[PDB]
Design a protein around this ligand. Sequence first.
Ligand SMILES: *[C@H](C)[C@H]1/C(=C/c2[nH]c(/C=C3N=C(/C=C4\NC(=O)C(CC)=C4C)C(C)=C\3CCC(=O)O)c(CCC(=O)O)c2C)NC(=O)[C@@H]1C
Ligand SMILES: CCC1=C(C)/C(=C/C2=NC(=C\c3[nH]c(/C=C4\NC(=O)[C@H](C)[C@H]4CC)c(C)c3CCC(=O)O)/C(CCC(=O)O)=C2C)NC1=O
Ligand SMILES: CCC1=C(C)/C(=C/C2=NC(=C\c3[nH]c(/C=C4\NC(=O)[C@H](C)[C@H]4CC)c(C)c3CCC(=O)O)/C(CCC(=O)O)=C2C)NC1=O
Ligand SMILES: CCC1=C(C)/C(=C/C2=NC(=C\c3[nH]c(/C=C4\NC(=O)[C@H](C)[C@H]4CC)c(C)c3CCC(=O)O)/C(CCC(=O)O)=C2C)NC1=O
Ligand SMILES: CCC1=C(C)/C(=C/C2=NC(=C\c3[nH]c(/C=C4\NC(=O)[C@H](C)[C@H]4CC)c(C)c3CCC(=O)O)/C(CCC(=O)O)=C2C)NC1=O
Ligand SMILES: CCC1=C(C)/C(=C/C2=NC(=C\c3[nH]c(/C=C4\NC(=O)[C@H](C)[C@H]4CC)c(C)c3CCC(=O)O)/C(CCC(=O)O)=C2C)NC1=O
Ligand SMILES: CCC1=C(C)/C(=C/C2=NC(=C\c3[nH]c(/C=C4\NC(=O)[C@H](C)[C@H]4CC)c(C)c3CCC(=O)O)/C(CCC(=O)O)=C2C)NC1=O
Ligand SMILES: CCC1=C(C)/C(=C/C2=NC(=C\c3[nH]c(/C=C4\NC(=O)[C@H](C)[C@H]4CC)c(C)c3CCC(=O)O)/C(CCC(=O)O)=C2C)NC1=O
Ligand SMILES: CCC1=C(C)/C(=C/C2=NC(=C\c3[nH]c(/C=C4\NC(=O)[C@H](C)[C@H]4CC)c(C)c3CCC(=O)O)/C(CCC(=O)O)=C2C)NC1=O
Ligand SMILES: CCC1=C(C)/C(=C/C2=NC(=C\c3[nH]c(/C=C4\NC(=O)[C@H](C)[C@H]4CC)c(C)c3CCC(=O)O)/C(CCC(=O)O)=C2C)NC1=O
Lengths: 65, 160, 160, 160, 160, 160, 48, 161, 161, 161, 161, 36
Amino acid sequence: RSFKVTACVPSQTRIRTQRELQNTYFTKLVPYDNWFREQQRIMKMGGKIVKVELATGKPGTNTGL
Amino acid sequence: SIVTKSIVNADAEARYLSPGELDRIKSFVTSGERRVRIAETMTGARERIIKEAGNQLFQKRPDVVSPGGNAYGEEMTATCLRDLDYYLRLITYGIVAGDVTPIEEIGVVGVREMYKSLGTPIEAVAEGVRAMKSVATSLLSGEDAAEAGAYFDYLIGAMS
Amino acid sequence: SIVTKSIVNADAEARYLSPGELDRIKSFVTSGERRVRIAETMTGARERIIKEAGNQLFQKRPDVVSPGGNAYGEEMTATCLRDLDYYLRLITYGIVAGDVTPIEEIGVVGVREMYKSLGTPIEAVAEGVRAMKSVATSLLSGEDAAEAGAYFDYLIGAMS
Amino acid sequence: SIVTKSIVNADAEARYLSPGELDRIKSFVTSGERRVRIAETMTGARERIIKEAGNQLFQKRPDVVSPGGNAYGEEMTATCLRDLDYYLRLITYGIVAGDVTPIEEIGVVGVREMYKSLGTPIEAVAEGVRAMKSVATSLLSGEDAAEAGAYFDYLIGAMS
Amino acid sequence: SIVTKSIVNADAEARYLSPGELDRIKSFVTSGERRVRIAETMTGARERIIKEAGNQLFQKRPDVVSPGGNAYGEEMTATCLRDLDYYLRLITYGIVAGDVTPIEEIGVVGVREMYKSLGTPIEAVAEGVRAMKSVATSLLSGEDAAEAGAYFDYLIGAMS
Amino acid sequence: SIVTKSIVNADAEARYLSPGELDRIKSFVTSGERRVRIAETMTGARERIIKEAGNQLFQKRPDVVSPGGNAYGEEMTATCLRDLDYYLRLITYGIVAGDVTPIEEIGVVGVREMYKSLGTPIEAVAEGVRAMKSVATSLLSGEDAAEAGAYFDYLIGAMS
Amino acid sequence: GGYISSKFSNKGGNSGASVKFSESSTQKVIRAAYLQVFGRELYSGQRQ
Amino acid sequence: MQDAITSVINSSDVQGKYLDASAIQKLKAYFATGELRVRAATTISANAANIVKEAVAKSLLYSDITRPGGNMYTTRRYAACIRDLDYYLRYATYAMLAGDPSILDERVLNGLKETYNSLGVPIGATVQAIQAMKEVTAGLVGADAGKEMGIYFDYICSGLS
Amino acid sequence: MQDAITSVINSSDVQGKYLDASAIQKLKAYFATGELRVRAATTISANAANIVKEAVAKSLLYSDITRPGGNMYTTRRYAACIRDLDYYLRYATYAMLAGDPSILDERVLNGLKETYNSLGVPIGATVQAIQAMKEVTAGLVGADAGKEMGIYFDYICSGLS
Amino acid sequence: MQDAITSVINSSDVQGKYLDASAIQKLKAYFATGELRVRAATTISANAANIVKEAVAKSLLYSDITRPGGNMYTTRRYAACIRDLDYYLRYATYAMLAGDPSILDERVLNGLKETYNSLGVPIGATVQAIQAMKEVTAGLVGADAGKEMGIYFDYICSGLS
Amino acid sequence: MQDAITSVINSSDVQGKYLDASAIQKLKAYFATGELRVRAATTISANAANIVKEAVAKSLLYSDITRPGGNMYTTRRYAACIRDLDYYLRYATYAMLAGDPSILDERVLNGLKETYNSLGVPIGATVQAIQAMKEVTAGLVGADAGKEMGIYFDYICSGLS
Amino acid sequence: RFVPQEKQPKAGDPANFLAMAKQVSRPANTVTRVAL
Ligand SMILES: *[C@H](C)[C@H]1/C(=C/c2[nH]c(/C=C3N=C(/C=C4\NC(=O)C(CC)=C4C)C(C)=C\3CCC(=O)O)c(CCC(=O)O)c2C)NC(=O)[C@@H]1C
Ligand SMILES: CCC1=C(C)/C(=C/C2=NC(=C\c3[nH]c(/C=C4\NC(=O)[C@H](C)[C@H]4CC)c(C)c3CCC(=O)O)/C(CCC(=O)O)=C2C)NC1=O
Ligand SMILES: CCC1=C(C)/C(=C/C2=NC(=C\c3[nH]c(/C=C4\NC(=O)[C@H](C)[C@H]4CC)c(C)c3CCC(=O)O)/C(CCC(=O)O)=C2C)NC1=O
Ligand SMILES: CCC1=C(C)/C(=C/C2=NC(=C\c3[nH]c(/C=C4\NC(=O)[C@H](C)[C@H]4CC)c(C)c3CCC(=O)O)/C(CCC(=O)O)=C2C)NC1=O
Ligand SMILES: CCC1=C(C)/C(=C/C2=NC(=C\c3[nH]c(/C=C4\NC(=O)[C@H](C)[C@H]4CC)c(C)c3CCC(=O)O)/C(CCC(=O)O)=C2C)NC1=O
Ligand SMILES: CCC1=C(C)/C(=C/C2=NC(=C\c3[nH]c(/C=C4\NC(=O)[C@H](C)[C@H]4CC)c(C)c3CCC(=O)O)/C(CCC(=O)O)=C2C)NC1=O
Ligand SMILES: CCC1=C(C)/C(=C/C2=NC(=C\c3[nH]c(/C=C4\NC(=O)[C@H](C)[C@H]4CC)c(C)c3CCC(=O)O)/C(CCC(=O)O)=C2C)NC1=O
Ligand SMILES: CCC1=C(C)/C(=C/C2=NC(=C\c3[nH]c(/C=C4\NC(=O)[C@H](C)[C@H]4CC)c(C)c3CCC(=O)O)/C(CCC(=O)O)=C2C)NC1=O
Ligand SMILES: CCC1=C(C)/C(=C/C2=NC(=C\c3[nH]c(/C=C4\NC(=O)[C@H](C)[C@H]4CC)c(C)c3CCC(=O)O)/C(CCC(=O)O)=C2C)NC1=O
Ligand SMILES: CCC1=C(C)/C(=C/C2=NC(=C\c3[nH]c(/C=C4\NC(=O)[C@H](C)[C@H]4CC)c(C)c3CCC(=O)O)/C(CCC(=O)O)=C2C)NC1=O
């Protein structure tokens, strides 16, 4: 049950002399049971959630996760 | 199911499923023509199991029938049989599945939340479920209730 | 054993044991008489197994007897037949314990770095267990060869 | 290249390149023609450095030629020459860059999971390429066989 | 030094040393016979440097030694010339290491927090070092100008 | 602000607001008419504060107004005041919010990279914003010179 | 090959890729990830 | 993450000027209504579970999604939903003291719009629930603070729809 | 990840009907041929490092694709595509026991299309490798279960091409 | 991350050939100009602050981009102007030492069309900042390698625009 | 077919009561916005070959999809794809004219979710084309009526995803 | 004290040791094998 986020987050307080292109464009896959503790982490950072996608199976299926 | 729990465990070890567990699926499929009698007997007594286990519960906890509990009135004792029937509509989904993977995702995973959110104490809910799975063990055979009664009594410790 | 997978995979979620996993416990203590007769017969002909499956292994892979290989001379082939007797003993533990785990801990999790530090080929002993299972399933019964031959099949399938 | 190893050594700490490090690049440019003279001596004398040193490997390890082993006389010993010819090609890729990584990314990164699936002793390749570069140092000089000597020994310590 | 961080970059990957940086150690130790020759010239004329770097500083920023400034007094300059004498000790440590981590671990890391506390301005001590850079590069020839002035650059750009 | 700090601290523990913290906001809102007239004490006299600290900065440091310095000429001097005009606007935002949180996100988090790139000395700004402090608190009252001056003294130590 | 998902319209990957430099720069992150969480190098039959 | 005092600061900063007389007329308007916002913050956070147990009772408890065929029979899906409607009560009361809808934007509204489309749940049942949450919360805190909490409920409601 | 047993459980609770008569012969069809699958899935694990011996040696070993210039010529690209074939066998055997290809499109087929068009992997070489490994399993499990294994092998090749 | 040294390794590998005599003179073509890149890379590294001040002074510092409402108005953003301009200078001299613009497409020009769009950074301003940075580093190096430096700056500006 | 007039007829008829005040507040809101919706339905029908063009020329041309390999390579796939995007826009304007998405529940979202997975149509690209067609339409009709299509454009996207 | 665990008798399984000497030919020459 994995999602597929794509997240644009800026650097809040620090001016990072290394590149950190990947630290502004997490387009990772997060599973369902730990997305919502993870979604608030981007949300408290001031990031922007662009899209979320169901990379796994069908919604509404109440068994088999 | 027991097929489903074995293959997700073998994915975690990143190997094929073990010959210890391959006995169990082989034991599940020779008992696949053993599990189906438990499923059909609960069809023939689902109007008999629930209508007796309510009064078994209401003689154990008559705080519910008193005015002020969460099932008081004829419109309110409808759900205190309907939520019990819904749990009888969960075991037969997992008798033939063998284990608790349809028991969890329909019944268990947030059941501390919504009965608190509806105001019903789950200790009364688990009591009638325990009152249910004394009558269903007496209805089934001594060999049927030896394993399904162990499977019956998961839900009482899972709820409360 | 059967408990050692189940007592760990339910401790990690910090729950009590699910009654699908209590089938796995029930599932065998009824097989513990049948699991004990086979390892008594395996130990009872453990000299005939190593002297036969060690013999025609070298008709299949004659390289390790040949000079330039590791087991040149009788002083190393008898050292080589220690690992045949060790793995025969580790089969008989795993049949009695019931599943995959005691042969995995004692004789598997270092063998890509033990045998590389010894310089011996890691694939050639994997040929020998298929002959060790050839002589063993040739001497036991037919109904236990689907059980006892499969515990051989794990220590093949994680060796090569 | 030694240019390419220098940038990622500076880009990890997000830095412009050190002028002591540009001395290594400026020494690499004025000694760039010398390494091309090293590489043509290998490619010109390829047919005397492969059939000899492979035969040194077969004299050191006569396990290889014998049946039951990895090689056999008609083409399997011939294709263990071309699987040995690839590494001499990778050394000549490595010495003209002044760097290890043309030996790395083509012929190091997955050789253990390759040759276990191919069924050859990976240590015999390492003893074979040790026999390859023992005669390669005596080929060209005593001066140029030291800083090209530093790229010979790495592939020995990559197989094991 | 180069050798003490080529260890750590190779230790945290748990690898042995690559031969690319073994060139970097080998080119460093044959440069050791000429880098200490720079440091013997630097410590031989420290009193010619420190007296001249004081008078090139105090003409540029005359407010710090005029009263109302921090270095006012007969002895308060004598500590403040000594506080600039320490950076000549460290640059001779940075010359013989070929590196800048003895500048870093000794004379960089908390240098903003000292002079904020003591009250001297942080750029005014940095302007003495570029005044010290103009005389110490005038002590040496052309090929020792950039090799000494690079470590002078790093102490300027860190404090400012 | 105190409203912003009390939410974000209480959001991270997933709790509502404490009654100790709700009376913090309740006194903060009702005293907001006190703080806005401290803000209009400065913006009513902003063009005098710039001009007096304009004369007070170039007296104590005349190299920035000198030819060669970074504010030389009637347009190149016009800018340094206009930069001081920004910091009246920033500190007036800080008294209104009751915190240095609009000082952070607007004004102070990148000054150590900006003026090093722009060539102006940060300590030249750090006295001009300190001469701003002496001309402001003479115009304010007694008690709020500790209140507004804490936003002044935050801009000194975060500058230098 | 780069970030394959979230298309990232221009990439000059050189998908032929005889020698990339990027394989060593991602091999030693993986070895350092094992070296911190397990604290040691893992055995070769165990690394997922 | 901002509040109504710093949003007036930010609307004056990005325009350019100082605290002009239009902003002080806006800022003094916040300090007058800020007294009632605290006295309605406590009586929501007292009855935070009592609101959401009644707001589900107006619209959701006997409908399409209790007879089999919808979102909530699966016990995790109903318990997420009571927990989702709990967090609307927390963030609107975070929006009530802060005096702006922009705290709801960087905490609720940006992510949640595309998940509910992707997870197949109805937004139309959610906006029916928050409007049912609006008609009970005005009864608890009083009507005059109900016009305050009716703003940020609608910003969730217009934002999700 | 869910099997055919959970799938008929999934299609029975959601409409409000009990465990009816028509669901039983879907399960009895599973319970009839489920004894065949445990005889099948053990023998694949006997040859799980031996099918991949034959996987290269039938269609990939002494070909021009392995000759320098092709896609399968590097040691980092060789060993990455034996594990990429070994995973396609192991997840097939999970589906051999599932009675369902619904372990494939969660863990195998989720990003597998776009990662081969981007990495330069030829699609036609894989389906000439995977469909070649259908018939060697037909000599190891017998006639009928290889035709059952040919369903999920074609479900790979329907979901790869 | 291909060097011009490694590019002729990349072409000679996929031919299946050794170090060809055509590849020898191509390596000597890089080795001849390699003296004129090491002597020009020291000038850039000693003038990185002495270039990027003079690139923003020609095109950036007095416009509607440093006013309030401008994109680089506050010093949180102005420090992320110079540093995001410093990457285009620090990676310019990186490919100058390699003679190959493949470093720019893997490390720099990777998501920058997409990243600057979803922050609000105008691409039409920073394309002029690079071209103003090209005309100042041409005089600091000379017309030999300033021809060679200048082919990377529009190469950045091609995929950025 | 349920108009927003006829929707509150049917919700009043299932109770069998007359029109209350809160039902009339749906009508008098709907009678207020009558002239706004009629102005939008004219200017879409005068531009319905250009709204369908600037949606696909923004989001889908020169992409993966118009290139050979997936789903819009041939012309008959392109004619079928512009047949859908014309029909979505023509069915969105009826819900703008009705004020109820029951047209989209009855005439569009019946077989469409099932027939796209059954055909191999990418839902994730055609949920983007209607999403790209919204801000063309919100600019073409004016943002007062541009906030009116956004309920009924994304009612397709709530159903089709 | 000298035994504990040893099956000394290799005895019968050995031995072959026929052995062989192997020649050298060019790798490039298609000995390696090229399918298609
Ligand atoms: C377009 C950018 C996307 C796309 C379109 C596409 N669709 C089809 C096939 C069909 N489309 C429909 C659509 C509808 N039926 C309805 O009732 C309504 C509501 C008014 C709609 C929108 C139907 C029924 C079909 C199948 C029958 C037919 O002949 O068209 C195709 C053709 C597929 C093929 O293989 O030929 C295409 C290309 N597909 C894409 O790639 C885009 C994401
Ligand atoms: C190595 C390849 C690479 C680069 C270059 C890169 C840049 C980059 N520039 C950024 C921001 C920024 N970039 C600018 C850019 C500019 N200011 C202007 O006015 C001009 C138009 C332009 C420079 C001339 C600004 C103002 C910000 C801050 C706004 C934001 O947070 O995005 C950020 C956001 C994080 C932060 O710095 O706070 C990144 C990651 N990322 C990468 O991976
Ligand atoms: C409990 C798990 C376990 C096992 C099974 C084991 C075997 C084992 N094999 C050994 C040596 C060895 N074992 C072999 C065996 C073989 N090489 C081959 O070519 C064949 C494939 C195979 C036998 C047919 C050989 C050749 C040596 C000697 C290695 C040498 O002399 O370099 C030794 C050291 C010698 C001794 O103590 O007598 C042990 C302990 N050790 C363990 O810890
Ligand atoms: C440059 C990076 C690189 C390497 C290293 C590489 C190796 C490689 N070695 C191979 C085979 C082989 N390699 C050997 C080698 C040996 N057997 C022995 O007895 C000896 C101990 C040993 C070498 C001295 C043999 C016998 C085969 C054929 C195996 C078979 O056909 O089953 C093959 C398969 C056939 C071929 O295409 O040549 C490859 C691809 N390919 C690459 O792209
Ligand atoms: C090697 C590492 C190292 C550093 C960095 C160091 C700094 C240092 N500078 C000091 C004092 C001082 N340093 C100065 C320096 C100056 N006044 C000026 O106006 C000029 C800008 C500047 C020097 C050119 C002055 C005036 C004092 C005395 C401060 C006082 O007594 O109030 C002191 C206190 C006196 C003491 O403890 O001996 C220390 C520790 N000592 C070290 O061992
Ligand atoms: C609100 C946050 C904020 C800050 C801090 C800021 C600084 C800032 N100061 C600037 C220039 C400048 N700033 C100064 C100011 C000074 N130089 C001096 O010599 C004086 C000592 C000193 C003032 C105390 C001058 C003279 C320039 C122009 C320098 C040049 O053009 O080379 C510039 C470039 C041109 C411009 O003003 O648009 C910026 C962006 N801008 C901002 O938006
Ligand atoms: C199949 C999975 C499933 C679960 C777990 C479930 C729980 C569940 N029980 C409910 C109500 C209820 N459940 C009960 C049952 C009880 N309360 C009592 O006091 C009795 C003692 C006790 C039974 C032991 C009652 C009385 C209600 C309605 C509560 C109310 O109207 O206030 C409701 C809200 C109404 C509805 O839509 O059904 C849910 C979702 N429903 C499900 O479909
Ligand atoms: C604080 C900002 C924020 C919001 C608002 C939010 C929503 C959110 N709602 C979710 C699930 C859910 N929400 C519902 C909601 C409902 N069921 C119904 O019938 C009603 C229409 C509605 C509520 C009464 C359902 C059925 C699911 C499960 C659907 C799924 O499994 O994806 C999930 C996935 C797991 C989780 O609960 O954490 C998130 C992340 N997340 C956030 O971070
Ligand atoms: C569990 C489900 C699953 C599968 C099936 C899977 C495949 C997979 N194959 C990959 C690469 C690869 N796949 C191949 C494939 C092949 N080479 C050939 O000769 C043939 C065309 C084909 C034979 C199978 C090659 C060569 C690469 C590496 C690309 C490279 O060399 O850079 C990669 C990229 C990462 C890497 O291995 O470097 C993934 C993720 N991943 C998964 O998670
Ligand atoms: C194999 C069958 C096949 C056809 C028929 C086909 C047509 C086709 N032509 C296109 C564009 C185009 N086609 C043309 C061609 C022309 N306009 C002129 O004035 C020229 C005289 C004329 C050439 C005959 C132009 C100019 C565009 C770009 C239109 C635009 O970008 O607005 C596009 C959109 C871009 C894309 O995704 O590919 C398609 C799909 N593609 C195909 O794969």
